[PDB]
Amino acid sequence: AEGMWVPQQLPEIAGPLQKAGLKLSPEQLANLTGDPMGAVVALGGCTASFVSPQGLVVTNHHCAYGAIQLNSTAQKNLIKDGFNAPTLKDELSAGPNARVFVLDQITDVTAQAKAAIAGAGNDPLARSRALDAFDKAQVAACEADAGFRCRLYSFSGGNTYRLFRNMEIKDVRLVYAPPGSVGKFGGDVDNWMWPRHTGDFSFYRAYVGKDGKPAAFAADNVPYQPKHFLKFADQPLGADDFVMVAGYPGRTNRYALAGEFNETASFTYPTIAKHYNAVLKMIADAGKADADVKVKYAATAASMNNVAKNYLGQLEGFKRIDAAGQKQAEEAAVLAWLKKQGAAGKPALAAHAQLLKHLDTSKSTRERDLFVGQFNNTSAVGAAITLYRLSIERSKPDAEREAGYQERDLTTIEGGLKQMDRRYVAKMDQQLQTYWLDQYVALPAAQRDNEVLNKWLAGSDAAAVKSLVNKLGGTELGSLDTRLKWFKADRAAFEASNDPAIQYAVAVMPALLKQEEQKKIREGESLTARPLYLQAVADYKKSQGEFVYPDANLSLRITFGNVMGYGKDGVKYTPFTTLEGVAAKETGEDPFDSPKALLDAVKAKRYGGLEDKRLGSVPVNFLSNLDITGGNSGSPVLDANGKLVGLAFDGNWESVSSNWVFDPVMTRMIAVDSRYMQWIMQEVAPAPQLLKELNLA
Amino acid sequence: AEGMWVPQQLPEIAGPLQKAGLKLSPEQLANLTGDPMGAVVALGGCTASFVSPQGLVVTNHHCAYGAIQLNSTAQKNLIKDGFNAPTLKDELSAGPNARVFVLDQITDVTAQAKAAIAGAGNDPLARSRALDAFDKAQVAACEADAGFRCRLYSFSGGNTYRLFRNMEIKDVRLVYAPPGSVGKFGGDVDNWMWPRHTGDFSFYRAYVGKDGKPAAFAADNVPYQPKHFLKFADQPLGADDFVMVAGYPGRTNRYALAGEFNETASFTYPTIAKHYNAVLKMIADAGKADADVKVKYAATAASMNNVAKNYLGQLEGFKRIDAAGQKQAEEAAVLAWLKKQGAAGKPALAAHAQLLKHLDTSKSTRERDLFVGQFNNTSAVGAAITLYRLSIERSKPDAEREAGYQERDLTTIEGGLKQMDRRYVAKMDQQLQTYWLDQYVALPAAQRDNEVLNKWLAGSDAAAVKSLVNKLGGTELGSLDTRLKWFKADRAAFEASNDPAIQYAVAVMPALLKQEEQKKIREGESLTARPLYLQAVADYKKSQGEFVYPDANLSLRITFGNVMGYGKDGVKYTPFTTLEGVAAKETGEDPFDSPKALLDAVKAKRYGGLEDKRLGSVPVNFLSNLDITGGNSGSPVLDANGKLVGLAFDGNWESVSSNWVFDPVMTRMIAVDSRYMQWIMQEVAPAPQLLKELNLA
Ligand SMILES: NC(=O)C[C@H](N)C(=O)N[C@@H](Cc1ccc(O)cc1)C(=O)O
Ligand SMILES: NC(=O)C[C@H](N)C(=O)N[C@@H](Cc1ccc(O)cc1)C(=O)O
């Protein structure tokens, strides 16, 4: 079924859920802290679920990848080898910034948010500041009880606001990862593709302090005891079976203006794809020379590969469904249905005119802004800018500090400085600085007008780039102890430093704050125009009998449907892959190099009690017509009785354009079968202690 | 069904033919001069069929490609634009060497053939001379009457010989080619692939003299009047329907020794694929600088692309099926079942050992021969060699003159020299010479042992190479008038010449004569072993209950089966593509750039009365489980009633390794549907005259 439904829309989908084959009462799904919705957790960018009363959490391999990478070395490469913790004391810290978010409360605060915004009057900057102040005040009251973290969400262009309250678990530990040849079987070749043969799962455990409250990593912390956890399905999942997913999809753009789509399609996607492919080649080469570079950059390399391929896929999808034409036709239909509405349709019409006007601004600057933005987010330089910015915000009252630099953010900023120790090699950062400066100096003189960067380059040729990178090479911010000292320093200490990266951060900061003010002004202009126009598109969609649900915004959504394949001319993709399909893709070369224990077990047909007689094998991955996107990785797939049948992890090639224009015919979720998760942990990369904790043997 | 069955095996397959759904009687197929088998013709390298009483001939577009290419220019480009002859007098000559062969009779000459080898003593070089002299004279006697070509065919190793008598039509004209965007839709992306959306068809017309003798192009020649032609099917072809193919498969190697295979798998296919891909980037890049080079090399570029991708497919198929393992499992089981025969065993076992001994001889030379052989079959040099070789062979008598330089070949040679006119560019041929020399002077010293070439280079680097390519540039064999002058010259004239390429021709020839004598020795040894060993295999296979049928050898063969898809894990390929699948592949860029009339007709559902309701569209290509290979292109696909339902043109990716080890699971023929052929000539690139002549519209 189409739609990323908010829990508040359960009454609207209760009928369709039952019709598709849900056997729980839809009222059971409305209890978001009860069984089974309360077992579903957010990780920040990924979804997961509790699967034991001792706080075992299951997610995707590609979601645990960062945690596995932080715990890898060139000699003891867990990304390659996998990992198991036979006892609680063997479990590895997933890193200081790993989180498990357990939902406590959702509060509708629409009337209060709109009243704060209207109270600002006509000043766009005051409007942006009023919503910021309202956001901070709501979150401060909601976070007064220790161990809770709150977030304000904006839905449907700012027509609805809800405050989420979560228990914020801060001590997350790695329990199990299959080898990378299972967790990431077929690598970037099979990424965004069906048929798929990927064992994309891994396990964490949530810990709390001995007092029961969230705490950073400590030896005397103890497993979290969740109220609810999911059980693995006893009923075999088959073709046509009902499935549903609860999770935290990140961002969709289905309510984008036609010109927002056109800019993304003609500039953003092809440009990012081109540069990311070129940076990835540089990182791959550096990794072949030094396995420490390969391990330190592995999370960055996987993320960048996934984004570049996704973008190429969206561009192919747009041509497949003529997204440009569908956008143009819908925008024309809305603007005509408004006109026929008389005076009542004039505000929305004028909101549209204001948003249309906002687009033009980001032409002629957009290549400069990309290169300078990427240069400033290289490791040493980005740490310098963050650290200098924090020293400035520290001197203000907490309520007046920029979102991201308040007291409630200090442990996250510190965590980032710590995690950089496992993700930084000076010789690799130098090559990334060179790459983005080289793009900047290759711009036309009118466009390469960043005055501070022009002063530091003092040239526009290869010699000038090399010269600036040589100077910045004198930085001490590669040192963890140096970063942690700067984290505590006042703004005068930064302004007196002769560290070249710190000098650079001090030089660029005035122009960074001015650019922030311009953004906040544009934000304040959208806070009145975007809701009026997006409400009109929704009203028009409702008048046309179309499904109305908000674009994804990192909050909890429900999607449902059935196990099923899809087709193109001369091809029908069947809903399951099987063990024999993994072995048929074997080449013995990364990324089609399965463990010997897997190839041996498939050759012997060791199906370990997990064979589905309908398939004649153990299923590996499956397709269904659910509506997921980035953020839904690791979402539990529940059957008709709310039992776990698999994890969401990817979409088929033709699905990725559904970010902009939903296509029901070729949009499928790719999930890993819970039976393959069990088979890997039984026959290939054993976790007997885990199968026991899951009551699976 | 497996098997390239010779017509004499029709008794063996008459059951299967009827169980498969043949409505004709198998007796009716036995009559090779009858309906429909008499409508089937050989083009030498392609199959075709008579489709009208006025000698109208149907084949594939990639079969007519050479003809279209000979009639194309950078200004008037019939590859890109296509072609139509509304009247007989608009039909363009297909080329001097373009042929239609009509089968007249087959006679078994086994006994007489084995005598000619037996009574040669037991010397190698005498048996080479012996069989040749027996073939030469047996063909002369068969080609008594003016308008016939005959050929001796070596089957099942030499356990069968047969003589083929054909009427040789020497005036073939192009009637119709669709646009290259239709005839070669998907180009080398979609080549050897399903799903496929290629209208791979074109029409010739066969011409004779007014007397009724075949004759060369004369403007007063008349259309041939075949005794039989095929009718287009009126019954709509669907999934599971019976189909059969009759045609002229070139070469299969399912009876080769494990060592012949392992040499091909380990050296020949990887080396040729590597060097052809490099040579193809040269032609590609050069063709982009010169729109004249592109047209002139288009035929060799298409051919080499086809072979390079085929060899990559074979290598992957060998790994999929464990070709190496199955062969050594057969070549070991044969030798055991012969050591279990005792007395009857020993000839087969000795015969094996003789062939085993002939394998290693090439090992230190292959990289040299290939690079040299290639350099020497360069155009300028290749012309220069063959002319001088003829001027040498002229002064000898017939029946002692080497086959291919005889009286009956003289017309074919001049053909070559004329055709070269539309296939030659100096700076391309130099680039080509440059490549194959650059490869030669890359070899180690001990292998870089061409007396003449190292001589002519004086050094072994890019400078020495550039030296000789710029020397050979001085030639004037780049002129047709020059080439035809030398065609009729005597020998002494060649030796006097100061043309660098004639001089090179003269210099290399003694070494060429020597190497061919040795070549002829080598074959001699084989002519007694091969029949002995392959007959044991044939009986070992017979004993196991495996289909027994000889390797393809350019003679007439029957294959049959049913319209059906194939699969692999997660995917079922359905047996038909449709118009909508063509549209869906549209990118506006080569090779996914359909005629606007096709995209417009599709969008509008102009199905033109050709829709199959079971598909809800007009079908484009279809799959079936027949057994075809190179040479089968253009073969008519016949339904249950012996009506034309399409033309064979390709195989799916997995099918190509069946050249060594047949696999019935993933071997399918790809054929173009007769309704797509009609549809194209109705709605897209019109041919109302052909529609009339075929009795369709
Ligand atoms: N290695 C992977 O498989 C990552 C995967 N391509 C991915 O990015 N998954 C995201 C989930 C997703 C599912 C379906 C669609 O259409 C988009 C995104 C995720 O990581 O959350
Ligand atoms: N352009 C093409 O489609 C050429 C095609 N790949 C080809 O080589 N066809 C040959 C026929 C053939 C069919 C099936 C198999 O397995 C091999 C070859 C041909 O030209 O005869």
Within A361-450, residue ranges assigned H as helices are 366-376, 379-394, 410-420, 426-441
Whether omega before A96 lies within 30 degrees of 0, making that bond cis, reads: no
Given CA atoms A243, A249, A254, A258 in this order, what sign does their dihedral have? Answer: negative
A267 close to B (CB below 8 A): no
Helices (H) and strands (E) in chain A, counts: 27, 20
**Candidate of B4, B300, B557, B650 to mutate for ligand 2, largest count of ligand atoms within 8 Å of Cβ:** B650
Report d(CA B23, CA A170) in Å as an integer. 76
Q: Nearest 10 degrees: CA dihedral of A500, A506, A508, A510?
A: -170
Q: DSSP E strands: which ranges in A497-643?
A: 557-562, 566-568, 571-573, 576-578, 619-624, 636-638
Catalytic choice (B128, B154, B633, B658): B633
A668 touches chain B (CB under 8 A): no
Contact across the interface for A572 and B571, Cβ inside 8 Å: yes
A203 within 8 A of A165, measured Cβ to Cβ: no
Report how far residue A535's alpha carbon sits from residue A159's, in angstroms, rounded to the nearest whole number: 7
Domain boundaries, chain B: 7-99+170-253+550-694, 258-532
Spell out the residues 6+ positions from residue A478 whose beta carbon is closer than 8 angstroms to its own: A380, A424, A426, A429
Spatial separation of the C-alpha atoms in residues A41 and A33, rounded to whole Å: 10
Q: Is the dihedral of CA B577, B579, B584, B588 positive or negative?
A: positive
Q: Which contiguous run of DSSP H or E holds residue A524?
A: helix A500-543
Q: Is residue B62 among the annotated active site residues?
A: yes
What is the bridge-based pairing of β-strands A619-624 and A576-578?
A: antiparallel
Distance from CA of A621 to the nearest CA of B (A): 9
Return d(Cα B637, Cα B278) in angstroms, integer: 36
Task: Classify residue A680 by its DSSP letter.
Answer: I
Q: What are phi and psi of B609, to 5 degrees?
A: 80, 15
Distance CA A656, CA A320 (A): 11
- Give B-chain residues touching A622 at CB under 8 angstroms: none
Q: Which helix (H) or strand (E) holds A135?
A: helix A124-142
Nearest CA to B18 out of B640, B642, B639 is that of B640
Residues of A catalogued as catalytic? 62, 200, 633
Residue B35, class by beta-carbon neighbours within 10 Å (0-12 exposed, 13-18 middle, 19+ buried)? middle
Query: Catalytic site residue B200?
Result: yes
Task: Please state, in angstroms and rounded to a whole number, the distance separating the CA atoms of residues B102 and B34.
Answer: 12
Between residues 573 and 612 of chain B, which touch chain A (CB distance below 8 Å)?
A: 573-574, 576-578, 580-581, 584, 587
Phi and psi angles of residue A150, each rounded to the nearest 5 degrees, phi first: -115, 155
3-state SS string for B620-683: EEEEECCCCCCCCCCCEEECCCCCEEEEEEEECHHHHHHHCCCCCCCCCEEEEEHHHHHHHHHH
Contact state of A195 with B569 under an 8 Å Cβ cutoff:
yes
Phi, psi of A384 (to 5 degrees): -60, -50
Question: How far is B472 from chain A, CA to nearest CA, in Å?
Answer: 42
Name, in order, each residue with C-beta under 8 angstroms of A119's C-beta and a sequence gap of 6 or more.
A130
A59 lines ligand 1 (CB under 6 A): no
From the list A197, A571, A576, which residue is nearest B574 (CB)? A571
What residues line ligand 2, using a CB cutoff of 6 Å? B 62, 191-192, 306, 628-633, 649-651, 655-656
The verdict on a CB contact (< 8 Å) between A194 and B570 is yes
Q: Give the closest of A195, A197, A570 to B573, CB-based.
A: A570
| Cis geometry, peptide bond prior to residue A195 (ω within 30 degrees of 0) | yes
3-class DSSP state of A116: helix
Distance from C-alpha of A529 to C-alpha of B445, rounded to nearest angstrom = 78
Rounded (10°) angle between helices B269-289 and B426-440 = 150
A191 lines ligand 1 (CB under 6 A): yes
Question: DSSP letter at A592?
Answer: B
The rounded Å distance from CA B669 to ligand 2 centre is 9
Question: From which experimental method does this structure derive?
Answer: X-ray
- The residue in chain A having the minimum alpha-carbon distance to the alpha carbon of residue B317 is A584
Q: CA–CA separation, A555 vs A429, rounded Å?
A: 34
Q: Please give the distance, rounded to the nearest whole angstrom, from the Cα atom of residue B629 to the centre of ligand 2.
A: 6
Distances in whole angstroms, Cα of residue A685 to Cα of each of A112, A608, A695: 53, 14, 18
Atom number of ligand 2 nearest to Cα B47:
21
**Complete DSSP assignment for B359-407:** SGGGTTTHHHHHHHHHHHTSHHHHHHHHHHHHHHHHTSPTTTSPTTSSG
Which of B412, B409, B376, B386 has the alpha carbon at shortest distance from B494? Answer: B386
How long is chain A?
Answer: 697
CB atoms within 10 A of CB A458: 10
Which residues fall within 8 angstroms of residue A264, CB to CB, at 6 or more apart? A253, A256, A660
N- to C-terminal Cα separation, chain A: 35
The sign of the CA dihedral A268, A271, A277, A282 is negative
In Å, what is the CA distance from A691 to each residue of A207, A290, A675, B175?
A: 20, 37, 12, 72
Whether B292 sits among the annotated catalytic residues: the reply is no
Distance separating alpha carbons of residues B177 and B174, to the nearest angstrom: 8
Interface residue A197 vs chain B (CB under 8 A)? yes
- Assess contact for A200 and A58: CB atoms under 8 A: no
Q: Are the CB atoms for A279 and A597 separated by under 8 Å?
A: no
* Structure resolution, Å: 1.9
From B319, B572, B577, residue closest to A574, measured CB to CB: B572
Q: CB–CB of A569 and B577 under 8 A?
A: yes
CATH topology of domain B7-99+170-253+550-694: Thrombin, subunit H (2.40.10)
CB atoms within 10 A of CB B686: 15
Using a CB cutoff of 8 Å and minimum separation of 24, what contacts does A598-604 make? A598/A182, A598/A680, A598/A683, A598/A684, A601/A683, A601/A684
Task: Write the CA distances from B673 to A266, B245, B579, B614, B628, integer angstroms.
Answer: 39, 14, 11, 15, 17
Do B571 and A195 make contact, defined as CB atoms within 8 angstroms?
Answer: yes
- Per-residue burial over B551-583, b = 16 or more CB atoms within 10 Å of its CB, e = otherwise: bbbbbbbbbbbbbbbbebbbbebbbbbbbbbbb
d(CA A363, CA B467): 53
Instruction: Return d(Cα B85, Cα B175) in angstroms, integer.
Output: 5
Are the C-beta atoms of residues B103 and B168 closer than 8 Å to each other?
A: no
Least Cα separation, residue B319 to chain A (angstroms): 9
* A629 alpha carbon – ligand 1 mean position (Å): 6
Does residue B388 belong to the interface with chain A, where contact is any CB pair within 8 Å? no
